[PDB]
Amino acid sequence: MREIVHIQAGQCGNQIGAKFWEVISDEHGIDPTGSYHGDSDLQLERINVYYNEAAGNKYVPRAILVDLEPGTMDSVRSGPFGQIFRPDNFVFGQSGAGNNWAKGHYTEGAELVDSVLDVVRKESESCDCLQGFQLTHSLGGGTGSGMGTLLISKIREEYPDRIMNTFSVVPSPKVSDTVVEPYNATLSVHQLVENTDETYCIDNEALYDICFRTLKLTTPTYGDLNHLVSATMSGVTTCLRFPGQLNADLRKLAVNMVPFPRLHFFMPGFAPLTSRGSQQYRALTVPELTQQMFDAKNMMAACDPRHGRYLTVAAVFRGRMSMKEVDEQMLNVQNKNSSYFVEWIPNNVKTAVCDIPPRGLKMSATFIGNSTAIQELFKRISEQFTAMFRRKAFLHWYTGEGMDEMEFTEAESNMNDLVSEYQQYQ
Amino acid sequence: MREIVHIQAGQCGNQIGAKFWEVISDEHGIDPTGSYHGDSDLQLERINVYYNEAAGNKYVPRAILVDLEPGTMDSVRSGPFGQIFRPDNFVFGQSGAGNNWAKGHYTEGAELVDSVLDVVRKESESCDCLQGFQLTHSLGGGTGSGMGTLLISKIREEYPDRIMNTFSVVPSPKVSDTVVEPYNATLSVHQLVENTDETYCIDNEALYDICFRTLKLTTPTYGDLNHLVSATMSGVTTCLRFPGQLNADLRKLAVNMVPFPRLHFFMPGFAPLTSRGSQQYRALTVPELTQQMFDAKNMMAACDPRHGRYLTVAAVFRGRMSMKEVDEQMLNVQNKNSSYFVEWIPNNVKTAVCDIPPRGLKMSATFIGNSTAIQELFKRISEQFTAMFRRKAFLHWYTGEGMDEMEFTEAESNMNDLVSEYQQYQ
Amino acid sequence: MRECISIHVGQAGVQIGNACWELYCLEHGIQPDGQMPDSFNTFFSETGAGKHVPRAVFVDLEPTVIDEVRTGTYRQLFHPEQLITGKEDAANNYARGHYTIGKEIIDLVLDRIRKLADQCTGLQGFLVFHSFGGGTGSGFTSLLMERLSVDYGKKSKLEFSIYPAPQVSTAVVEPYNSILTTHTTLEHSDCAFMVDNEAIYDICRRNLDIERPTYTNLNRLISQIVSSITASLRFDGALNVDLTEFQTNLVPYPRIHFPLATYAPVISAEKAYHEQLSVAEITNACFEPANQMVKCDPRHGKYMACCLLYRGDVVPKDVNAAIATIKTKRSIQFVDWCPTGFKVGINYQPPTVVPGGDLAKVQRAVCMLSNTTAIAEAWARLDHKFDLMYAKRAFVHWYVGEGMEEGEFSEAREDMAALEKDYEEVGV
Amino acid sequence: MRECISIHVGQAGVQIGNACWELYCLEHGIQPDGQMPDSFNTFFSETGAGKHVPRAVFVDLEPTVIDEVRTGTYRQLFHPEQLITGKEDAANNYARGHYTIGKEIIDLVLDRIRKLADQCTGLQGFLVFHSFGGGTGSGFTSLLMERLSVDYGKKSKLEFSIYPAPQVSTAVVEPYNSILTTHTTLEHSDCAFMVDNEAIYDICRRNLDIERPTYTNLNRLISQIVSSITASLRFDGALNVDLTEFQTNLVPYPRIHFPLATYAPVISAEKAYHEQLSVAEITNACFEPANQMVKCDPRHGKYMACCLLYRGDVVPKDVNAAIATIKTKRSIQFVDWCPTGFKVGINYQPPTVVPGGDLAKVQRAVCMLSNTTAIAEAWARLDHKFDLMYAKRAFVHWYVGEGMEEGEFSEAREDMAALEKDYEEVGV
Ligand SMILES: Nc1nc2c(ncn2[C@@H]2O[C@H](COP(=O)(O)OP(=O)(O)OP(=O)(O)O)[C@@H](O)[C@H]2O)c(=O)[nH]1
Ligand SMILES: Nc1nc2c(ncn2[C@@H]2O[C@H](COP(=O)(O)OP(=O)(O)OP(=O)(O)O)[C@@H](O)[C@H]2O)c(=O)[nH]1
Ligand SMILES: Nc1nc2c(ncn2[C@@H]2O[C@H](COP(=O)(O)OP(=O)(O)O)[C@@H](O)[C@H]2O)c(=O)[nH]1
Ligand SMILES: Nc1nc2c(ncn2[C@@H]2O[C@H](COP(=O)(O)OP(=O)(O)O)[C@@H](O)[C@H]2O)c(=O)[nH]1
Ligand SMILES: [Mg+2]
Ligand SMILES: [Mg+2]
User: Fold this and answer.
1) Which of C81, C187, C245, C425 is catalytic?
2) Are residues A88 and A235 located together in one domain of the fold?
3) What Pfam families does the database record attribute to this sequence (chains C, D)?
4) Subunits that touch chain D (at least 3 Cβ pairs < 8 angstroms)?
5) Ordered structural domains, chain D, with CATH
6) How many domains does chain B have?
7) C-beta atoms of C65 and A247 within 8 A
8) Is D1 close to A94, i.e. CB distance below 8 A?
9) Chain breaks in chain D (C to N over 2.5 A) after
10) Strand runs (DSSP E) across B244-323, as ranges?
């Protein structure tokens, strides 16, 4: 009854989308050919939320893959589970954005956005009642940032009453991948603060921290980080696909977590996460899950939650569990750390419980936190942008594409206003 | 693609021409009948630069022989390799110059130069793209000096865009083979400074010194001197005939060696040169070659290079070698003797390497030096000319042929200007 | 003869309805497919031959919870038309439940209520199950009660609601929804029975010796309370009270119509052996604050009226003696202007226990319904939370975007303050 | 899908291209006859059946060097019309290369590039290999760059050039040609990768333990560098970087586009056994002055932008750790206005080794493209030599006789001074 469409932009977006679709197919018992092979009918009752029935009992994911270079598209086509995607959904260009926001937003993005919007319009018209849109992309790149921004703007113009979710990776604090990262990040945030409903900020350094300290992984690989992100993504929308005691869809989480429209930047977390040698040394119960949530070590954003205050918190639990334990433990964790919770919002925590746990686990849970410590990341990105723009470095690359310095100034001012607001409500 | 046409004038010119053609034929594997008998195809790839294909796989040299008496031409025709020359190329008179510049330039030269010019014009039109001309002659003789200068003037009128080289033997300081040597030498250099691109000065006593001290030759003969000169001549143009790592043709050497149009008088040298006994007591390496180059004993001009400064230096290496050694040793020899190198020209040395070494030798190299010390030779010739002209000695021999004393004064002034410039740049 | 209609709204109302109808089917011997191998006529309709269908309506703006009913064990029990489902939930938003999403489906539900009413000859009233904190269970419930009051009028309507707990709450915007729903439904509900999840959690942990009570246990206990209330209609007793008697005996003033329910005895099989469960001891247990089903302290309040529903092997004389003993106790107090504050009801059929349940089989039981001024404390804490949240205008834009107005917020605040003032004035 | 076209000009360019195409044929398993027993299409075209022809153009104004190609082992690999030869060499004369002899052959070369580009669908840009000191490699290369910029425009052009060395140089008139060609191709270049001869001599002598390096070893090393640069296009990896990304990440200002190249690890088989070649230490080795490919001092300069290209068994976490360790080091420094100074690209294909080569087979390799202000020192020594030579008007008549004017010398001097001023101003 409720439908979710998927969009993947850029190399990072495509890779996370591939991992997420593999995880979802594993959950629903669908083999890489599109034929259902599960046992429990619960895997099939709400399968339409992510899959389309295309005759012959074959299910095709409701996804659109977008990129300005064929490389990642070819890699995802040739890789595992690359067959199930519809060949018409692969919309790819030839030039490539070259890690430039202006190229992906103004030059090549303008050319490709018409075809991408046509495909997304056909997909949305094919469904009965879409819940909303979700997009995976990066804010440091040229294809991801600019193209996903233009796409979000176009859909928000077309479908104003639907939910827009994004799972975007923000630039890392310590070591950067691209030289021009701050420009793209600042412009992308400038557009996101207006054109989206909720954003989940992911940091690669946080994922490395998790994989090293918590998962005891000797040699982490990008596949593992995408695995963690996909686990979070599956955890968020679990109540739309399986029955439970207390159900919460995307709109419920939105109405519970964002008090003011510009304050919709969340940090996600997942539990449990244990190494190979450490499974035997813990009894998997609700106390351990809720302890693993409220911990800076387990956060997927490179921001310390104890440097600020939580505005709202959402905890989505999966598995057969007792509601009394959940409620009393949320109350207890609120009581013990009252210094980290905003005083003028009683009951900062919103709860939801789903009966079906992920395959292989008896219990699992997903944490979404709207804290004011994201001001640190925004502040440092703004500071780097100011340092670069002071000397007009790399400015001709963006200016030659038709961009103006006024756009840079507007983006800087908007980020400063947002950090001012986040400091104000602290 | 690039063709060189050879000219021989006078007794000395004809003798060195015969020796040089013998050496070249041996290098290219051509028997004294004109038929190819070598093994390596490299001998035949660029054989057109000196030989014409005259049907029936027979090659004839592209050379013109000139003299005012049949004696030397009869001798060269009767001697070894005399058959390969084309009979029509033998242009000779009957009178003879009698060691008089006027006869060779005005009286008999005027009559015979038209036929010589027709022959060279035919030869040049036969080739597709000529590099230039080279002349072998003497400045102390009557036929050689006058005819060589007149021919040089005529060709420079006819072909102004082509390189003009001369291998001229100058009157020598200690002993003199002719009483009237300075007069002919004076007029010869007067014409040479204006009508040539580069001239290589050869001195008989320098060759005698090399043969005695270096080659340990008890009884040197004109054949050995001409052999050394031919070795130098073949070394100069080796890059036009064989492949190499760094290639330098005549035009490259000119543009690298002559900084001002009047300063194109070089002093060539060759290495290695060892006797029969002394061949066992050294290892043939680049250090020994470059040591043999920069030595007054090994130079073919009767002028000490240490009495002046080197303007430019060209070192053409033959054989399979390492370029690192060549560059490092040129730098080293530049550094050690900074007092003998001009300060306002960095990198006085130009290098070039050819893969094919001369037959019999593993490695060899040729040195061309443009040094101020040639001022000593010019000053000596000028002083002798002034000493004889003060008393008007032997002046009627030259006056009766139609010459005027004004020409003598102009030539004396030209030497004075030349030596003044050479001293100035010191 | 006399019939009763049940309406279940929202997730909580629907799940409570499943528990209640399972208990009814167990009591009357009706199989899950609707057959049985005649006082049940007040709760089940007879269709065709040997098929009994409940007189119930199930409403929710999202399909999953009622899809569970349509797929579960009791799929054959319910008429497929009287299970109404929407496509989008209200998402914890009163405005969506009231205006934006509520109005699309209310007409079909009203049609279904009317159709259930045609088959009724002696309809006594309506029972509504819902939660104060939810989006649909607040907004759509309020809209439904307004339309019902407009349409039917004098027929009584009784409420069974999930009042938000003092310190244990699930949602964040609960104070907004609670204040708005009381403001809207104050004048349209004849009587409301509130229970609290925290109190039932405590009761299950202490008296039933359960470590991890779930929602199913709470629903089972609530169904026991409801069955105790309606046993007078569904059977024949020595001294019975119907739906109208509750309203005419529990509300002293129209605006103060908020009694709370209390059930006894709630013991497991382990402790049922070591107690001779007489009438006096269970009557005493009904008055103890730790046993009450709303987290609140009756010690700081005053009783205006009490209703007792005796079930099973009970005789009137022991009841009268227990009432006298309660009256002499100085620890509890009745307000001065109510010399008589007790309503007694006695029934013969003992309480049936579901197989696999947590309660043990008992000979006698009591369901207490009393009006106490201590509810003003919970009202005050709710209003304090509302004031704290509304001082910053947090989450207002969500409600405004769906068609609401801040003037409605102010009106609800003023009305709840007036209700608190009325409670205080009654107290003295 | 996407294609890259190579141009090789002059003796140095032709020989470097020979080494490069040998390495490409080895990497893609193409025999010297063009047959193989599909990502190679970016460098090789497919004609008929079982034949691959490189997308390259070889130009020289003298025939001997290209005659060696036409007679050598790879005579069957190249298309006979894409090996263009003149008759007369430029003779280290910029005027001859640019006007007198260049204009007779330029149109044929342009026609060949047009024919080659007609067969490409996703052409990325042009790679040109040439030498600064030669007459052809300066004059004709500048003419080609100008005409290419006029005709194609936005397509990127990259140069691999042989910088004149500080103390070891072959020709005499080299400063004239270098200054003139830099002045001419400043405005028509997108980025130029710079190498020097004695630098590679030192690397071969020290790290490779070779006593007498020749031109072949230098060309092999340059080939390895170019293959490392284009591996992102010719294969697939964890994180790829195309031609445009280099230009957009390494060039902060249009006139500052002279990064220097650096390769690691360059070690023989003797020392390969005694070193565990991981990511960290090769990353450090790429930053030391003794290993860079231009004889220059970076310790007295400031880095502006850094690009690292990893190949083989490399994981991103080790790359991140190595970059962090480099950043925390004080002995090297980054300019203030560039807080983020690194660009990372990772490829899966390990480097291939030629048979009989000097480098050993290694699991991982790094290509470093660094933009630093230290190039100003080499600039300054070049201007010192040019001014010292031009004070006496030496060799000027050679250039004037071919149609050049002394005003061009003055303009080149002024432009080079302006470039030095720009570098100095950016440095502070
Ligand atoms: N006693 C009891 N209370 C419940 C149960 N299920 C939900 N609740 C209460 O309902 C409150 C939230 O409202 P819901 O019923 O879940 O939501 P809703 O009424 O369907 O309204 P929506 O937000 O539109 O879904 C929670 O705070 C719970 O206290 C239940 O099974 N038993
Ligand atoms: N690294 C390297 N440098 C070379 C090579 N060949 C020539 N060079 C450089 O080129 C410079 C001289 O220019 P050349 O390439 O020889 O001549 P050109 O570029 O063809 O121009 P012309 O003088 O007209 O022939 C020398 O100083 C060398 O440093 C080579 O194979 N490898
Ligand atoms: N988590 C994660 N991050 C990635 C992945 N691939 C790239 N990234 C990040 O994305 C950034 C590069 O942006 P990119 O998507 O390549 O630019 P684009 O091609 O223009 O969209 C880098 O900072 C990487 O850290 C991936 O597979 N997983
Ligand atoms: N090196 C060398 N010099 C010669 C040879 N024959 C003559 N000479 C020199 O030439 C001079 C004689 O001039 P000559 O050629 O006979 O006069 P011409 O007949 O007018 O050309 C003498 O000074 C000799 O030193 C020779 O075979 N080799
Ligand atoms: Mg609900
Ligand atoms: Mg050359």
Assistant:
1) C245
2) yes
3) Tubulin, Tubulin_C
4) A, B
5) 1-259 (3.40.50.1440), 260-374 (3.30.1330.20), 375-428 (1.10.287.600)
6) 3
7) yes
8) yes
9) 37
10) 265-271, 310-318
